[PDB]
Amino acid sequence: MNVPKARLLKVAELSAKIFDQNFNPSGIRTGSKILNERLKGPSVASYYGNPDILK
Amino acid sequence: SRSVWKGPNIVPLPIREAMTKGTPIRTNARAATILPQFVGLKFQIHNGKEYVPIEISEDMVGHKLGEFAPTRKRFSYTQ
Amino acid sequence: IQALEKSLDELAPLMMTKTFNTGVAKASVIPVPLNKRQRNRIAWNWIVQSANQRVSSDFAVRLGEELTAIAKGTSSAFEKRDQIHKTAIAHRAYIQLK
Amino acid sequence: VVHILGKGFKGKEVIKIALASKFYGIGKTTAEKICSKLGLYPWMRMHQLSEPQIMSIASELSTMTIEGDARAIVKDNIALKRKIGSYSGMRHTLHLPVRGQHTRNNAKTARKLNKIDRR
Amino acid sequence: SNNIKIKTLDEFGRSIAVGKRKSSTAKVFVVRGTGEILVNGRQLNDYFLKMKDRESIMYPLQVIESVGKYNIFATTSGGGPTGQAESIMHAIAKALVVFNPLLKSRLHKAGVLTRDYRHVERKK
Amino acid sequence: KSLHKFRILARSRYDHTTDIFKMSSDKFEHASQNARYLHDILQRLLAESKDLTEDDFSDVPLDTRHTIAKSLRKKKRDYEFPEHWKRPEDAPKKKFDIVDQLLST
Amino acid sequence: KRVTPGSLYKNWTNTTHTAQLQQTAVPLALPIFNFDDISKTLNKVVSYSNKQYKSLHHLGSFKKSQFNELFQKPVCLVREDATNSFLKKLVSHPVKKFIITGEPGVGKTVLLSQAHAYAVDSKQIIINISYPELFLNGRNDFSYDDDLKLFIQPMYLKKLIRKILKANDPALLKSIELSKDYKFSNANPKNASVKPFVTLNKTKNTVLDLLSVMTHPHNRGKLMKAIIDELSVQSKVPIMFTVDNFSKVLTTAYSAYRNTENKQIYSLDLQMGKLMMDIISGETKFANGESSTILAISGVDRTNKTLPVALGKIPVDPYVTRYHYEPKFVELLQKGNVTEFEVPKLNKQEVNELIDYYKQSNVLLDKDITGKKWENLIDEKYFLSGNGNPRELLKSLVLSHR
Amino acid sequence: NENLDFYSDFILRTGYYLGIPLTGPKPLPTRRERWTVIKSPFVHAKSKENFERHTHKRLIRAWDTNPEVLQMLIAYITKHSMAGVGMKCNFFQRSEISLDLGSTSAVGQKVLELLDSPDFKKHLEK
RNA sequence: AAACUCCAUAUAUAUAAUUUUAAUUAUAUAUAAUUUUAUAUUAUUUAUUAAUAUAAAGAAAGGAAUUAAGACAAAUCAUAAUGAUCCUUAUAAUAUGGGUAAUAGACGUGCUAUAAUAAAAUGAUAAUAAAAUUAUAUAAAAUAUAUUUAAUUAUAUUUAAUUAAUAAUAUAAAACAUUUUAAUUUUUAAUAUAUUUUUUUAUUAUAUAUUAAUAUGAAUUAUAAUCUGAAAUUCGAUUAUAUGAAA
Ligand SMILES: Nc1ncnc2c1ncn2[C@@H]1O[C@H](COP(=O)(O)OP(=O)(O)OP(=O)(O)O)[C@@H](O)[C@H]1O
Ligand SMILES: [K+]
Ligand SMILES: [K+]
Ligand SMILES: [K+]
Ligand SMILES: [K+]
Ligand SMILES: [K+]
Ligand SMILES: [K+]
Ligand SMILES: [K+]
Ligand SMILES: [K+]
Ligand SMILES: [K+]
Ligand SMILES: [Mg+2]
Ligand SMILES: [Mg+2]
Ligand SMILES: [Mg+2]
Ligand SMILES: [Mg+2]
Ligand SMILES: [Mg+2]
Ligand SMILES: [Mg+2]
Ligand SMILES: [Mg+2]
Ligand SMILES: [Mg+2]
Ligand SMILES: [Mg+2]
Ligand SMILES: [Mg+2]
Ligand SMILES: [Mg+2]
Ligand SMILES: [Mg+2]
């Protein structure tokens, strides 16, 4: 808490760089969440079973 | 209430023809947000059965077209 | 504690008349004996009702005052006991004894 | 009894609570700021106030939107809804719920209070 | 053959017993001492705020009149204060029988050696 | 000094209590790819920690708030039997059994 | 009205404290507390002297929830590991700055009352702050003083100054002649309209005169600074400054008061907070070498890392939020070299003495006297009290009807 | 549990001959899943039937073994697996800090394509 | 049918290199009770007996499932499935919007409340649980804003660990302690007073109205912002300021 914010920001920025993380000090909404969400299409589209069944 | 940071709910509408010809805009997009450009233009807004004619004023900007085309009839009892 | 048990033993009625719906005719008011657990309930409810007429906001204080007055002889619930015992003495013949 | 801007207060009432209770438009947070601005300690009561301090409260209260002014803002916002013909305006005119509440049952409070000239 | 081996004090003179009540469990270490008790490393008055819970823990020692003759190191987990206090009570009673097996009958008669079976029942 | 800078830059990935630095990755589709990715990050973190020419972050103390939060979610049984309570003289003493003593000879 | 002159209308805790229920207690003849003859009273229950009772009542040494109403007057067990041990350190240690700790109800307040009793006997001037919450809860007036640059609290200061005057021997106060001339505004309703100010000349007036000055509320902060300065410059009489429930100060850095910007006022911006911490930190030095500063914590207050760090019991964690760690208080406490004295729990022999006194006071139930062996009772009550807690011992004896 | 325990016993026998120190099978907490249904097809929501499924778990640990021998164990026990038994294997490989040769998302690509299309470039023009 | 069972409980053995730790546990197997014995009393079909108590041994005190018959031609053709009969450019199929959310009265079932044996704050070396969930995810810590020293609450930024006896949802809550609490002049304040000092006593001021709605209650409503979604108008959730009904 007594650690100057400038010092703690330098650690955050360098740490984010090493760990390939997005450093957004301002907090602007960037949409990064949308880019990271998983694709659920394959699971959703198999709900009713494999269509290539022997008939 | 749509978050302000997302912007208006913009829908495809024929506004150019209504601004160069004065024709009414018939639409079912009741969710559409009345943008400041729409002011002065004439809209025919679906209510599920009919198309209600409404002209947009400056006190309607920000609201949505559906708000001005009631979908139900006033209730009455067989007293 | 000894004061509480003495007060409960003096205030609780020994017997109480109860109406039994025996027969299509009018019910009978027959005196019935009470056990110690049933006697304590009757006397405690009288104490609580008397306590809740006092001025203190705290129930513990009102209860404490009520219990102190009863341990010192003064209580309005002794009238209730006398009226329950009078009724039973009147209906002494209604008892069955078999 | 202490009188501030016509409102009457019992002497024992705490100032920060009394102000948010009798004055339309002033709540708990707003009342605390007024007392902090006038140097009144958090739990000071009305009977303690002097006449110079009673006048200071009235001055600060007269530089705010309260009572009629605050009530007029609500009445004018409701009137605008009716003027533009919005669905919400009709609900106010019909004395019906304006926030999506069901009407098959209940809806008693909306029937008593919902009106263009809302109190 | 039988499945019971005589219980005896351990290398440090301690009698170890486990007790259960509701969802709570307690493992106590009883040794000869002067009446010192520790519950999960904390003072009895700190861990158990209710005096009735403290009185429950002391009852088995009060039956054999040995409240000042033993040191108890009780460890308890699960359930609430009542389950833990009575689980410790049950475990102390079972641990006291090793010091004098002639007092088991008195402990059984007081009811401290009977495992309380009552638990929350899903409504049926 | 480099060990301190390493621990500061790891942030939530370092547990001071256990001294363990743990990082996982499932970003790629194959485990081999993910293994290389973690290895490459490890080399990058070590290089920065061993380059104290500009900043060593010695003024910055280690932050353990993440570890404290984790500890509050696990039950800690950190109490042991008092040593001054032990009574070794009350333990049972092995008895003399002639049969077992005679069966061994 | 529903309330009559003698009706018990308050809650239970206030009724027991205020209803004068000790009147029916039986008078017992106990030895008197005297540290100079502790050998004759060690490990025995003693009453205080008549001179000590008068001073300790004016200081607020006796508090509610101490079962004082069970006995004719409050009594204390002179303990070897708590009372005798602490008082010997107070007479020998050169710094004489202590903070009394221990588990809730262990007897920290009673120990402070025994230190007040010692000071009364040993001709010392006692300044006690019994309940610091009274100047931090925002329930009395406050004003900003430009000359002091502090928020003064006139209502509280008036009560505190009277306590210092009524609790201490007038002779000691009269001995301290004033070192400077002082002028204050006159608020005495007799000559206030005739004399604009009251002057206190040096070498003529004493600190007793200074403690009797009736001034306007806005000049009462300057009267508290003069009193403390006069008592800290004189070397004749030792000054014992005490604060009970000091944990409240350590855990309430920001008072309930708000400035003109609706910002809560830091406790060190109040004169009471600044004065208290100036004496503890050592900024305000007392000329007499027997002056002491005894602080005591209370279990009714929340705990955090402030006090443990100040006492050296745990390492400093810099990332602890300010609401759980106040580094400024730690600096002040460590600058004053405050040392901890942990009040130990009672041993079984001390429990025996207390229960033997309770039997003679007729406070024990009939279930603990008839049909129970004395040794069994002591063992049971030592177990049910947590192995020594005095407060849990009393509750097990007089407040456990199950 | 029956096939689970039998198969676990077989793994221990396979490991012994392969020279693999093995511990277990350690029983892990059984997971219980529950479903409550209404017995009637249409109405009568007052009579409800209970159903459950228990997942039985066992942990077998391998120690002080070379990777190649460990793979032989997994291959053999896979070849002779029992019905209705599943198997997860966590392998732990101790390595050196620095190694030799080591040990773009679809959405991001489409965003770049979309931001270059005329429907977007026509606005980005400054 | 009952029992024999299964669960719970007690105990024993096995398993865990006791850092997947809860060994005070996990879960496989086995054992145990439908308890047993002695004595006195009262009844008996009086004997090798029941009801009772007393003593002794014991951890032992609770549950589930367990099938046959018939009826209401009771519900369901709207979980799906069958006959008959009807529609086949429409009674089938798709899209956009609307409705299922309407409102006089009435009924069922709930929630919140109408204050002092009860509500509100605060409690960081962190009082004390169980059962569940996390690959169509659970989201830590930190930072920023509301917003104030900080905490708290909400959201944003960022996305650590864990696909799990490992990490996360999640420091359970009540309890308990302290403080506060309208009606209540049972209060507060100014002086003086005390051997009740967080307090007592005295004298002044502290309101009027008032069978009544407060610092109880939180319906209704204004404005601003936020969350999910392609979309929140009919018709969603949350927050802030203000509003503060009935009871
Ligand atoms: N030496 C003693 N002789 C007699 N009674 C004592 C003694 N010490 C403590 N007590 C009693 O124990 C109880 C608690 O005492 P005290 O109030 O001093 O404790 P405390 O630790 O200061 O409490 P808290 O943590 O609440 O501030 C009281 O009833 C007190 O009278
Ligand atoms: K208001
Ligand atoms: K509706
Ligand atoms: K209804
Ligand atoms: K373990
Ligand atoms: K709809
Ligand atoms: K309430
Ligand atoms: K929990
Ligand atoms: K009201
Ligand atoms: K909407
Ligand atoms: Mg990750
Ligand atoms: Mg947290
Ligand atoms: Mg104290
Ligand atoms: Mg039908
Ligand atoms: Mg419906
Ligand atoms: Mg905890
Ligand atoms: Mg967080
Ligand atoms: Mg976990
Ligand atoms: Mg907690
Ligand atoms: Mg609470
Ligand atoms: Mg309220
Ligand atoms: Mg009414």
Short mmCIF file of all heavy atoms in Angstrom, two decimals, chain G residues 290-324:
data_model
loop_
_atom_site.label_atom_id
_atom_site.label_comp_id
_atom_site.label_asym_id
_atom_site.label_seq_id
_atom_site.Cartn_x
_atom_site.Cartn_y
_atom_site.Cartn_z
N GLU G 290 9.06 9.69 37.38
CA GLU G 290 8.13 8.64 37.77
C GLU G 290 6.82 8.71 37.00
O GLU G 290 5.91 7.92 37.27
CB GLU G 290 7.85 8.72 39.27
CG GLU G 290 9.10 8.74 40.14
CD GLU G 290 10.03 7.58 39.85
OE1 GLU G 290 9.55 6.43 39.80
OE2 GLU G 290 11.24 7.82 39.66
N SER G 291 6.70 9.63 36.05
CA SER G 291 5.52 9.71 35.21
C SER G 291 5.43 8.48 34.31
O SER G 291 6.44 8.02 33.77
CB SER G 291 5.54 10.98 34.37
OG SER G 291 5.63 12.13 35.19
N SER G 292 4.22 7.95 34.15
CA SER G 292 4.00 6.73 33.39
C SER G 292 2.86 6.93 32.41
O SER G 292 2.11 7.91 32.46
CB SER G 292 3.69 5.55 34.33
OG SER G 292 2.60 5.85 35.18
N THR G 293 2.73 5.97 31.49
CA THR G 293 1.65 5.95 30.50
C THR G 293 1.21 4.50 30.36
O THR G 293 1.89 3.70 29.70
CB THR G 293 2.09 6.54 29.16
OG1 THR G 293 2.39 7.93 29.32
CG2 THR G 293 1.00 6.37 28.11
N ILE G 294 0.08 4.16 30.97
CA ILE G 294 -0.45 2.80 30.96
C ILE G 294 -1.67 2.78 30.05
O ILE G 294 -2.68 3.44 30.33
CB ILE G 294 -0.81 2.31 32.37
CG1 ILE G 294 0.33 2.61 33.35
CG2 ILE G 294 -1.11 0.82 32.34
CD1 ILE G 294 -0.01 2.31 34.79
N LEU G 295 -1.59 2.03 28.96
CA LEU G 295 -2.69 1.82 28.04
C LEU G 295 -3.24 0.41 28.22
O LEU G 295 -2.52 -0.50 28.62
CB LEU G 295 -2.25 2.03 26.59
CG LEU G 295 -1.45 3.31 26.31
CD1 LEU G 295 -0.94 3.30 24.88
CD2 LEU G 295 -2.29 4.55 26.58
N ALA G 296 -4.53 0.24 27.93
CA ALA G 296 -5.16 -1.07 28.01
C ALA G 296 -6.11 -1.25 26.83
O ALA G 296 -6.87 -0.35 26.50
CB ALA G 296 -5.93 -1.24 29.33
N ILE G 297 -6.05 -2.43 26.22
CA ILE G 297 -6.96 -2.78 25.14
C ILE G 297 -8.22 -3.40 25.73
O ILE G 297 -8.25 -3.75 26.92
CB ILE G 297 -6.30 -3.74 24.13
CG1 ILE G 297 -6.13 -5.14 24.72
CG2 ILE G 297 -4.95 -3.18 23.69
CD1 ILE G 297 -5.56 -6.14 23.75
N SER G 298 -9.28 -3.51 24.93
CA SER G 298 -10.52 -4.15 25.34
C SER G 298 -10.95 -5.15 24.28
O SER G 298 -10.74 -4.93 23.08
CB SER G 298 -11.63 -3.12 25.57
OG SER G 298 -12.84 -3.76 25.94
N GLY G 299 -11.56 -6.25 24.72
CA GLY G 299 -12.04 -7.26 23.79
C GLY G 299 -13.31 -6.89 23.05
O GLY G 299 -13.71 -7.62 22.14
N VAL G 300 -13.95 -5.78 23.42
CA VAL G 300 -15.14 -5.33 22.71
C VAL G 300 -14.82 -4.66 21.39
O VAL G 300 -15.73 -4.41 20.59
CB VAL G 300 -15.97 -4.35 23.57
CG1 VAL G 300 -16.30 -4.98 24.92
CG2 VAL G 300 -15.23 -3.03 23.75
N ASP G 301 -13.54 -4.38 21.13
CA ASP G 301 -13.11 -3.71 19.91
C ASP G 301 -12.60 -4.73 18.91
O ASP G 301 -12.11 -5.80 19.27
CB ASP G 301 -12.02 -2.68 20.21
CG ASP G 301 -12.56 -1.42 20.85
OD1 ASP G 301 -13.41 -0.75 20.22
OD2 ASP G 301 -12.13 -1.08 21.97
N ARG G 302 -12.70 -4.37 17.63
CA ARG G 302 -12.17 -5.22 16.58
C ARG G 302 -10.65 -5.25 16.65
O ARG G 302 -10.01 -4.34 17.18
CB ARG G 302 -12.63 -4.72 15.21
CG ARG G 302 -11.92 -3.46 14.72
CD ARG G 302 -12.56 -2.93 13.44
NE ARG G 302 -11.85 -1.78 12.90
CZ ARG G 302 -10.92 -1.84 11.95
NH1 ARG G 302 -10.58 -2.99 11.39
NH2 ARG G 302 -10.33 -0.72 11.55
N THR G 303 -10.07 -6.32 16.13
CA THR G 303 -8.62 -6.49 16.09
C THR G 303 -8.13 -6.39 14.66
O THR G 303 -8.86 -6.69 13.71
CB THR G 303 -8.20 -7.83 16.69
OG1 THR G 303 -8.88 -8.90 16.02
CG2 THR G 303 -8.52 -7.89 18.18
N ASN G 304 -6.89 -5.94 14.50
CA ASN G 304 -6.25 -5.90 13.19
C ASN G 304 -4.74 -5.92 13.41
O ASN G 304 -4.26 -6.12 14.53
CB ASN G 304 -6.72 -4.70 12.38
CG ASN G 304 -6.35 -3.37 13.00
OD1 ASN G 304 -5.46 -3.29 13.85
ND2 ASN G 304 -7.03 -2.31 12.58
N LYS G 305 -3.98 -5.72 12.33
CA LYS G 305 -2.53 -5.85 12.36
C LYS G 305 -1.82 -4.65 12.98
O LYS G 305 -0.60 -4.71 13.14
CB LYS G 305 -2.00 -6.08 10.95
CG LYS G 305 -2.20 -7.49 10.41
CD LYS G 305 -3.67 -7.81 10.18
CE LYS G 305 -3.84 -9.15 9.49
NZ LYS G 305 -5.27 -9.50 9.28
N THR G 306 -2.54 -3.59 13.33
CA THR G 306 -1.89 -2.40 13.87
C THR G 306 -1.14 -2.73 15.16
O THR G 306 0.08 -2.60 15.24
CB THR G 306 -2.91 -1.29 14.11
OG1 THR G 306 -3.66 -1.05 12.91
CG2 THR G 306 -2.22 -0.01 14.55
N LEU G 307 -1.88 -3.16 16.19
CA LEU G 307 -1.24 -3.39 17.49
C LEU G 307 -0.21 -4.51 17.44
O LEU G 307 0.90 -4.32 17.95
CB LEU G 307 -2.31 -3.65 18.55
CG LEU G 307 -1.79 -3.93 19.96
CD1 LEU G 307 -0.98 -2.75 20.48
CD2 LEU G 307 -2.94 -4.25 20.90
N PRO G 308 -0.50 -5.68 16.86
CA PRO G 308 0.52 -6.73 16.82
C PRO G 308 1.83 -6.28 16.18
O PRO G 308 2.91 -6.64 16.66
CB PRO G 308 -0.16 -7.84 16.01
CG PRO G 308 -1.61 -7.61 16.19
CD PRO G 308 -1.78 -6.13 16.28
N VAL G 309 1.76 -5.49 15.10
CA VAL G 309 2.97 -5.01 14.46
C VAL G 309 3.71 -4.03 15.36
O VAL G 309 4.93 -4.08 15.50
CB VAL G 309 2.65 -4.38 13.09
CG1 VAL G 309 3.84 -3.61 12.56
CG2 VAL G 309 2.21 -5.45 12.10
N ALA G 310 2.97 -3.11 15.99
CA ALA G 310 3.60 -2.14 16.88
C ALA G 310 4.32 -2.82 18.04
O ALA G 310 5.34 -2.31 18.51
CB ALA G 310 2.55 -1.16 17.41
N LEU G 311 3.81 -3.96 18.50
CA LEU G 311 4.40 -4.68 19.61
C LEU G 311 5.48 -5.66 19.17
O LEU G 311 6.13 -6.27 20.03
CB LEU G 311 3.32 -5.45 20.37
CG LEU G 311 2.23 -4.60 21.02
CD1 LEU G 311 1.21 -5.48 21.73
CD2 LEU G 311 2.82 -3.60 21.99
N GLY G 312 5.70 -5.82 17.87
CA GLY G 312 6.73 -6.72 17.39
C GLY G 312 6.34 -8.17 17.36
O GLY G 312 7.21 -9.04 17.24
N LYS G 313 5.04 -8.47 17.46
CA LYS G 313 4.59 -9.86 17.48
C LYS G 313 4.47 -10.45 16.08
O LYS G 313 4.50 -11.68 15.94
CB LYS G 313 3.24 -9.96 18.20
CG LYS G 313 3.19 -9.17 19.50
CD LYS G 313 1.89 -9.37 20.25
CE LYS G 313 1.77 -10.77 20.82
NZ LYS G 313 0.69 -10.86 21.84
N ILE G 314 4.35 -9.62 15.05
CA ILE G 314 4.26 -10.10 13.68
C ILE G 314 5.04 -9.17 12.77
O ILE G 314 5.24 -7.99 13.07
CB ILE G 314 2.79 -10.20 13.19
CG1 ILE G 314 2.12 -8.82 13.17
CG2 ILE G 314 2.01 -11.16 14.07
CD1 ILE G 314 0.73 -8.84 12.58
N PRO G 315 5.50 -9.69 11.62
CA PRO G 315 6.20 -8.83 10.67
C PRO G 315 5.27 -7.83 10.00
O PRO G 315 4.05 -8.02 9.95
CB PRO G 315 6.77 -9.82 9.64
CG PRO G 315 6.61 -11.18 10.26
CD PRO G 315 5.43 -11.08 11.16
N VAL G 316 5.86 -6.75 9.50
CA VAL G 316 5.09 -5.74 8.78
C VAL G 316 4.72 -6.27 7.40
O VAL G 316 5.59 -6.71 6.63
CB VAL G 316 5.89 -4.43 8.68
CG1 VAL G 316 5.09 -3.37 7.93
CG2 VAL G 316 6.30 -3.92 10.06
N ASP G 317 3.43 -6.23 7.08
CA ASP G 317 2.95 -6.60 5.76
C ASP G 317 2.54 -5.33 5.03
O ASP G 317 1.49 -4.76 5.35
CB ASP G 317 1.78 -7.57 5.86
CG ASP G 317 1.31 -8.07 4.50
OD1 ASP G 317 1.81 -7.57 3.47
OD2 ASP G 317 0.43 -8.96 4.47
N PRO G 318 3.31 -4.85 4.05
CA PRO G 318 3.00 -3.54 3.45
C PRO G 318 1.71 -3.51 2.65
O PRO G 318 1.11 -2.44 2.52
CB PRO G 318 4.22 -3.27 2.57
CG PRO G 318 4.72 -4.62 2.21
CD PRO G 318 4.52 -5.45 3.44
N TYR G 319 1.26 -4.64 2.10
CA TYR G 319 0.07 -4.67 1.26
C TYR G 319 -1.23 -4.83 2.04
O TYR G 319 -2.27 -5.09 1.42
CB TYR G 319 0.18 -5.80 0.23
CG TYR G 319 1.32 -5.61 -0.74
CD1 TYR G 319 2.54 -6.25 -0.55
CD2 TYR G 319 1.18 -4.78 -1.85
CE1 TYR G 319 3.58 -6.07 -1.44
CE2 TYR G 319 2.22 -4.60 -2.74
CZ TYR G 319 3.41 -5.25 -2.53
OH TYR G 319 4.45 -5.07 -3.42
N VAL G 320 -1.22 -4.68 3.36
CA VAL G 320 -2.46 -4.73 4.13
C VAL G 320 -3.18 -3.39 3.98
O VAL G 320 -2.58 -2.33 4.16
CB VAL G 320 -2.18 -5.06 5.60
CG1 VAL G 320 -3.46 -5.01 6.42
CG2 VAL G 320 -1.53 -6.43 5.72
N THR G 321 -4.47 -3.45 3.67
CA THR G 321 -5.25 -2.23 3.49
C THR G 321 -5.24 -1.40 4.77
O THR G 321 -5.08 -1.92 5.87
CB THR G 321 -6.69 -2.57 3.09
OG1 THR G 321 -7.38 -1.38 2.70
CG2 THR G 321 -7.43 -3.24 4.24
N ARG G 322 -5.41 -0.09 4.60
CA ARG G 322 -5.30 0.82 5.73
C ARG G 322 -6.35 0.53 6.80
O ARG G 322 -6.13 0.82 7.98
CB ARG G 322 -5.42 2.27 5.26
CG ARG G 322 -5.06 3.27 6.33
CD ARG G 322 -5.02 4.68 5.79
NE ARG G 322 -4.58 5.62 6.80
CZ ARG G 322 -4.52 6.93 6.63
NH1 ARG G 322 -4.86 7.50 5.49
NH2 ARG G 322 -4.11 7.70 7.64
N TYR G 323 -7.49 -0.03 6.41
CA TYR G 323 -8.55 -0.31 7.37
C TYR G 323 -8.15 -1.41 8.35
O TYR G 323 -8.75 -1.52 9.42
CB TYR G 323 -9.83 -0.70 6.63
CG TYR G 323 -10.98 -1.11 7.52
CD1 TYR G 323 -11.55 -0.21 8.42
CD2 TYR G 323 -11.52 -2.39 7.44
CE1 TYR G 323 -12.60 -0.59 9.23
CE2 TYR G 323 -12.58 -2.76 8.25
CZ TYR G 323 -13.12 -1.86 9.14
OH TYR G 323 -14.17 -2.24 9.94
N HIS G 324 -7.12 -2.19 8.02
CA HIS G 324 -6.61 -3.23 8.89
C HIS G 324 -5.17 -3.00 9.32
O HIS G 324 -4.60 -3.85 10.02
CB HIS G 324 -6.74 -4.60 8.20
CG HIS G 324 -8.15 -5.02 7.98
ND1 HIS G 324 -8.97 -5.44 9.00
CD2 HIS G 324 -8.91 -5.06 6.86
CE1 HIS G 324 -10.17 -5.74 8.52
NE2 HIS G 324 -10.15 -5.51 7.22
#
